[PDB]
Design a protein around this nucleic acid. Structure first.
Length: 188
RNA sequence: GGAC
């Protein structure tokens, strides 16, 4: 797809030399019940959470003061896997409707830069448990759950090294065709 | 009813 070719040329997806051994940074889980929203995020380099989640991420970003990354670990509800990793790149705009999400409920926007676009099954990660979340596995997290830095390094090591066989890019043409056709229906 |  020509949209996908332009994305691949602009970004360095799935870097072989990624630094998982973070000396500083903040890492959060992102959940979505729309697969279409993941595609939009990749295409437009944006995300939006709940109001509550947007404030939590805004605070993290502003508090880092550019000294280290804010990483976001993406997983679709019920999918059984993570689908990638993006870095937060701007503070939050709280009111704006992006106008690309499946539902009108998502209000606000912030910039992201996708780094990993790869399916990593939950069975690669469920041994990593979160002490700030009642010792639950990292794979059983709600939206914007924070992953403590030592646990996040282990998670990032696994996501970087995993030899994936699928990703959301496999379906990129499908998302583009649906986005285009649905827009026609709305404008008829 | 909801981005375990």
């Amino acid at each position: 797809h020509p949209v996908l070719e332009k994305l691949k040329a602009a970004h360095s997806y799935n870097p072989k030399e990624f630094e998982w051994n973070l000396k500083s940074g903040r890492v959060f889980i992102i959940k979505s019940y729309s697969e279409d929203d993941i595609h939009r995020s990749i295409k437009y380099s944006i995300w939006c959470s709940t109001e509550h989640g947007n404030k939590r991420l805004d605070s993290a970003f502003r508090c880092m003061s550019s000294k280290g990354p804010v990483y976001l670990l993406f997983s679709v509800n019920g999918s059984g896997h993570f689908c990638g990793v993006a870095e937060m790149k701007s503070p939050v705009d709280y009111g704006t409707s992006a106008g690309v999400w499946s539902q009108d409920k998502w209000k606000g926007k912030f910039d992201v830069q996708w780094i990993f676009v790869k399916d990593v099954p939950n069975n690669q990660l469920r041994h990593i448990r979160l002490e700030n979340n009642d010792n639950k596995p990292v794979t059983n997290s709600r939206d914007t759950q924070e992953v403590p830095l030592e646990k996040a390094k282990q998670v990032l090591k696994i996501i970087s090294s995993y030899k994936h066989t699928t990703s959301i890019f496999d379906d990129f043409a499908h998302y583009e065709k649906r986005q285009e056709e649905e827009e026609v229906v709305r404008k008829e």
